[PDB]
Design a protein around this nucleic acid. Structure first.
Ligand SMILES: [K+]
Ligand SMILES: [K+]
Ligand SMILES: [K+]
Ligand SMILES: [K+]
Ligand SMILES: [K+]
Ligand SMILES: [K+]
Ligand SMILES: [K+]
Ligand SMILES: [K+]
Ligand SMILES: [K+]
Ligand SMILES: [K+]
Ligand SMILES: [K+]
Ligand SMILES: [K+]
Ligand SMILES: [K+]
Ligand SMILES: [K+]
Ligand SMILES: [K+]
Ligand SMILES: [K+]
Ligand SMILES: [K+]
Ligand SMILES: [K+]
Ligand SMILES: [K+]
Ligand SMILES: [K+]
Ligand SMILES: [K+]
Ligand SMILES: [K+]
Ligand SMILES: [K+]
Ligand SMILES: [K+]
Ligand SMILES: [K+]
Ligand SMILES: [K+]
Ligand SMILES: [K+]
Ligand SMILES: [K+]
Ligand SMILES: [K+]
Ligand SMILES: [K+]
Ligand SMILES: [K+]
Ligand SMILES: [K+]
Ligand SMILES: [K+]
Ligand SMILES: [K+]
Ligand SMILES: [K+]
Ligand SMILES: [K+]
Ligand SMILES: [K+]
Ligand SMILES: [K+]
Ligand SMILES: [K+]
Ligand SMILES: [K+]
Ligand SMILES: [K+]
Ligand SMILES: [Mg+2]
Ligand SMILES: [Mg+2]
Ligand SMILES: [Mg+2]
Ligand SMILES: [Mg+2]
Ligand SMILES: [Mg+2]
Ligand SMILES: [Mg+2]
Ligand SMILES: [Mg+2]
Ligand SMILES: [Mg+2]
Ligand SMILES: [Mg+2]
Ligand SMILES: [Mg+2]
Ligand SMILES: [Mg+2]
Ligand SMILES: [Mg+2]
Ligand SMILES: [Mg+2]
Ligand SMILES: [Mg+2]
Ligand SMILES: [Mg+2]
Ligand SMILES: [Mg+2]
Ligand SMILES: [Mg+2]
Ligand SMILES: [Mg+2]
Ligand SMILES: [Mg+2]
Ligand SMILES: [Mg+2]
Ligand SMILES: [Mg+2]
Ligand SMILES: [Mg+2]
Ligand SMILES: [Mg+2]
Ligand SMILES: [Mg+2]
Ligand SMILES: [Mg+2]
Ligand SMILES: [Mg+2]
Ligand SMILES: [Mg+2]
Ligand SMILES: [Mg+2]
Ligand SMILES: [Mg+2]
Ligand SMILES: [Mg+2]
Ligand SMILES: [Mg+2]
Ligand SMILES: [Mg+2]
Ligand SMILES: [Zn+2]
Lengths: 156, 100
RNA sequence: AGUUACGGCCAUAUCUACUGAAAAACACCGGAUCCCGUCCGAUCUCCGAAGUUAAGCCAAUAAGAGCCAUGCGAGUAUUAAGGUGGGCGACUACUUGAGAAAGCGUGGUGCUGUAGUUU
RNA sequence: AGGCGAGCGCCAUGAUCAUCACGACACACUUGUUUAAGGACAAAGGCCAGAUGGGGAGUUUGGCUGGGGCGGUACGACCACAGAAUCAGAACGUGGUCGACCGAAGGUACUCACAGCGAGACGAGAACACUCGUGUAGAGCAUAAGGACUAAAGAGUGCCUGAGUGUGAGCACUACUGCUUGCAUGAGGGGAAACCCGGGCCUAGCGAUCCUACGCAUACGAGACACUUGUGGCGUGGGUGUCAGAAAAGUUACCACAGGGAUAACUGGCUUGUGGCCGCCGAGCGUAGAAAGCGACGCGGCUUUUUGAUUCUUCGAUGUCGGCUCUUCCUAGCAUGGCCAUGCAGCCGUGGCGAAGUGUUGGAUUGU
RNA sequence: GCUCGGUCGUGACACGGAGGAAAUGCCAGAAAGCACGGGUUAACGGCGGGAGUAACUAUGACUCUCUUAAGGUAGCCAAACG
RNA sequence: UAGGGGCGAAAGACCAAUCGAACAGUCUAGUUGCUGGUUCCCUCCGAAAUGUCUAUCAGGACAGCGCGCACGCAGAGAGAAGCAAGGUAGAGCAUGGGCCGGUAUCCUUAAGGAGACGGACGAACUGCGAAUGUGCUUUUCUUCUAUGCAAGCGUAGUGGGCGAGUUCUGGUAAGCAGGACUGGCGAAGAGGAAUGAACCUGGCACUGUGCUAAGGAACCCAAUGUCUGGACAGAGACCGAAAGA
RNA sequence: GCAAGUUGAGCAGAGGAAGUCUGUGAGGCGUAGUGAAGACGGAAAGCAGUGUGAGUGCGACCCGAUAGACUUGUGAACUAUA
RNA sequence: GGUAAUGCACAGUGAAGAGGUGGCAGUGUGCAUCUAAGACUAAAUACAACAGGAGACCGAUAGCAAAGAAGUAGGUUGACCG
């Protein structure tokens, strides 16, 4: 039978990668955080204070409050077939800034131009949506340089 | 476990750090005049047998170390709790490193 | 263009042999009276310029070891979905999709930020 | 009121109230010695208190479990493995550990490594102390297992008792418990300072209501007022290991009741280890010679006639071992009929093939 | 287990003592029992292991060693008891 | 001589067909987590056999899944497009464990040992690493959507499950014991596999005409014939191994 | 139905009467909370009925133990012993 | 219910003439309110047999066990049963 301590089953998780042992780099400490940013959790096994519980490893959430050397992040979780919000305390050594909003922020920068012109000249924005890839395109071909294919390889 | 007989620490009444005297807490004698003692005496009185349960299936070996510390200036007291230990000594000789 | 002080990413920067280097630096170097520290002015701390490019730091060289990239291995190994497919089983063919690794070939061998100094 | 030893205790005897034996009388009480004998003793009653007490009275005698019992603890905690690469995830599944220990093995600041290997240095050897060069951990880190750590978290050296005090918010399926983190304070610590510290490098070493002991200030107190006892509030200790927590020994073949095929003792079904029977290969043996007859070391099957393994059907009932009697079926063929091989001269045999028509007995010991 | 003897200790309530305004507590005191010393199995019951050693071999009268409250005598037996 | 009492040449025997504690009557309609039963029609919606704690294991409670009444309302059991985490299958044998053999060379012996290398390996070995599955953002992103969702309040049943396909652990195995994922039977009829809870086709108000599925088409039995190769065994259509001519 | 309020308490007065009508008039809950308490104070329509679903206690959906106790109740015509 | 004694008893002990009580043990002191250890008392309240009047009750397997010669016919050794 299995046990139920705070760091159960973390032999693979919570171990350093090959040729990457030691303390964190300066960039870790010089990064500034703000309320409302999206942030991503990855535990560093060498630091023993401010570690989250291993369920949260590799998950992304939103910063709710900022303190001297730690952050409070909001998560959601299913328990007993219902949704529950959870507020997780994490030290700054175990977090990295998330990339999940990157494309959306670029798109907002384009929208922000159009939405002004749409008051002056038009009435409503064109709004620049994405579209999924359509059907295969048409082609005009010169028809020299033909290559033949054959079952010449007998494959003993 | 070895404990020194003196400890400089914060005194709540004096509101600054002071010298304290350190010793093991002592369990005092039960009083017949309290409400629980009075109730039990009356209930036991007749031909009623044993009227309250007594524990028999006991299981623990140690009990928790508890220190009483007294402020030398104002005689106020604080209670400090230290966990379970089979044996305790006050003011013995230091555990000097690198013995023969 | 190098160097030097403080750095960033942490081997394209490592490890082993050899060889070069104008100027200014960087060093080795000469002492212990004091401050400071040793079994020991070796290390650490202080006060100095008689010497020297031999060393370190910097740079080149090597069908070098190791690291980094790419091609091939290879539509190979494994795998999702499907059928009144096959086989006594062990397991395996086909149809619509996803898709490696080791080895071995070829090329590389630090890049940059802020300030100071030197034709 | 006397006496002793450098007014003290010790030794003399004289007044004041109970009081334990012993005598001698008769009045309570006792006995058909009764116009009598005993006698304040006995014997007989009453109220409290100790002792003894299966002679009796009430009651109890945990759970999980390839049925129960005996055994173990899968009953409270911790690490690793597996459970078809998030997390979770059963079995009396696998390898183990816990109920503690430590004034430093706690807190801080600085210095320097280690295990080994190759050269050296009298006694001095395999193994004594001191040196030089290499050395990504091959060492250590009190105590399982995993993770972590290199101008350190390891080994030394200095100083300190933060193993402070109030009061908030959260994480682990979250009550208890453990940990993370906010603000305010200390005539707080260590460090030049930035920084760090409200136990142990991280994941284990633990416990409610009521009662009781101690610490802390603020309350209550019966018509009024004072004091000795008492009652409230917050926090810690004293303990429940069956660990979300009753106060508890057996036996019934003299036995009762409610139920159960949720579960055993027959048969049947599935399986075939064990039991029995058959094939394949050819090392050696047979007077020569693998194979007339055998056939090691290995390998593949069939049967249900042995005993296991499991619990699907029956507990408002399927009569349980052996013998007697009587019938039918199977073949893996003991005799009787036809044949083939031979290490078949003849006699007696041995190995094989088609074949189940007819036969296969009488007794002694023993329930068999 | 039953029985006999003494106290050296413990062991109730009463009866005393000290103190306090008083209650509650405290101290002394204390029979029988218990403890301690003897008796008792036609009372309940109980009654051992290991090594060597004799002119063939076997066996061990003999020796040594551990052990106890005492180590199964006289008889009887694969017996209704192997 | 009378019931927690009698009487016994002792068997728990006997005490009015009753005795290991008599009979009569009352308290009393004693108690029951256990067995049996529980009475009219149609319409609409529709489960669970799992988790935590329990002197708990034939029982409870709390939560999860139904239904009724519903304030209200931009959502979704599906994809894309950016982004994270993971150590299984395959592949390998660089730290640790561990099997067999080595040329030149080296060390001694005149044996053996070491070896520049090759072959064989681990659920508690890893240097590399899938497919499938999981989460985050964006409708400023395709596609659907009111006969739809639905906070809140009140209250039920359930808490013995079993089986198929794909996979795993214990065991020689088992119609054996125990988990995970996606649909079933339970609570599911109809047509087909001759028959069968779960397999194939495919989800049911009540009628009438046409068409197809799965499976069939000499006869039983509604619909059948054709072409080309194999095969002779009381064979096959239903059916066992290593070994063989 | 009435509403910062609400109500068939008991009981009295009327009435050819176990009905009905009218008084007097308590109490209860509400009109705002916090603490063990001393003490302090700052949001949210209620009361009484007529019925339905549902919890708890009483025989409690219906039937069913082996047992326990109590009597100033009965029995030795069978059977035991003097 | 009565909580460091609400009421009632038994044994020891046992008052004062002045005493009792004021929902928590004790001691003191003012204040308020009563008078135990002797007796009698109407009305307003409770409920069988027997008699009278009523009813959203039951209608001969119902309603009391019993709508007729019902505690009857009949039964237990007996208590009792029907
Ligand atoms: K006389
Ligand atoms: K006389
Ligand atoms: K006389
Ligand atoms: K008894
Ligand atoms: K089992
Ligand atoms: K275990
Ligand atoms: K360790
Ligand atoms: K009072
Ligand atoms: K009063
Ligand atoms: K108290
Ligand atoms: K306790
Ligand atoms: K328990
Ligand atoms: K018993
Ligand atoms: K008997
Ligand atoms: K059996
Ligand atoms: K049965
Ligand atoms: K029989
Ligand atoms: K024959
Ligand atoms: K025959
Ligand atoms: K003998
Ligand atoms: K014998
Ligand atoms: K007799
Ligand atoms: K009998
Ligand atoms: K009786
Ligand atoms: K039950
Ligand atoms: K439906
Ligand atoms: K259960
Ligand atoms: K519920
Ligand atoms: K390996
Ligand atoms: K593996
Ligand atoms: K329920
Ligand atoms: K069912
Ligand atoms: K269904
Ligand atoms: K059919
Ligand atoms: K079947
Ligand atoms: K036909
Ligand atoms: K009810
Ligand atoms: K009954
Ligand atoms: K009177
Ligand atoms: K009748
Ligand atoms: K009669
Ligand atoms: Mg897991
Ligand atoms: Mg008493
Ligand atoms: Mg120069
Ligand atoms: Mg000097
Ligand atoms: Mg020098
Ligand atoms: Mg030079
Ligand atoms: Mg059991
Ligand atoms: Mg430490
Ligand atoms: Mg801390
Ligand atoms: Mg810590
Ligand atoms: Mg428990
Ligand atoms: Mg069964
Ligand atoms: Mg077999
Ligand atoms: Mg059989
Ligand atoms: Mg029968
Ligand atoms: Mg039957
Ligand atoms: Mg029969
Ligand atoms: Mg035959
Ligand atoms: Mg015999
Ligand atoms: Mg279940
Ligand atoms: Mg049942
Ligand atoms: Mg593999
Ligand atoms: Mg179950
Ligand atoms: Mg069907
Ligand atoms: Mg009320
Ligand atoms: Mg208000
Ligand atoms: Mg009933
Ligand atoms: Mg009883
Ligand atoms: Mg009172
Ligand atoms: Mg009629
Ligand atoms: Mg009648
Ligand atoms: Mg008669
Ligand atoms: Zn003080």
């Amino acid at each position: 039978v299995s046990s139920h301590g705070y760091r159960r089953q973390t032999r693979n998780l919570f171990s350093q990668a090959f040729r990457k042992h030691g303390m964190p780099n300066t960039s870790t400490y010089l990064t500034q955080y703000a309320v409302g940013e999206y942030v991503d959790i990855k535990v560093n096994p060498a630091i023993h204070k401010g570690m989250p519980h291993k369920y949260y490893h590799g998950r992304t959430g939103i910063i709710k409050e900022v303190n001297r050397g730690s952050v409070i992040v909001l998560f959601n979780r299913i328990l007993a077939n219902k949704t529950v919000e959870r507020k997780v305390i994490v030290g700054i050594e175990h977090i990295r800034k998330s990339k999940c909003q990157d494309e959306y922020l670029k798109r907002l920068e384009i929208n922000k131009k159009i939405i002004e012109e749409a008051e002056k000249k038009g009435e409503v924005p064109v709004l620049f949506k994405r579209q999924p890839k359509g059907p295969k395109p048409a082609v005009e071909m010169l028809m020299n340089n033909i290559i033949e294919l054959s079952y010449d390889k007998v494959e003993s | 476990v070895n404990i020194p007989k003196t400890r400089r620490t914060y005194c709540i009444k004096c509101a600054y750090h002071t010298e304290f005297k350190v010793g093991l807490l002592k369990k005092g004698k039960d009083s017949p005049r309290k409400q629980g003692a009075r109730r039990y005496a009356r209930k036991q009185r007749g031909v009623h047998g044993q009227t309250k349960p007594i524990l028999k299936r006991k299981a623990k070996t140690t009990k928790k170390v508890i220190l009483k510390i007294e402020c030398t200036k104002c005689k106020s007291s604080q209670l400090k709790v230290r966990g379970r230990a089979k044996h305790v000594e006050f003011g013995a000789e230091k555990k000097v490193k690198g013995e023969a």
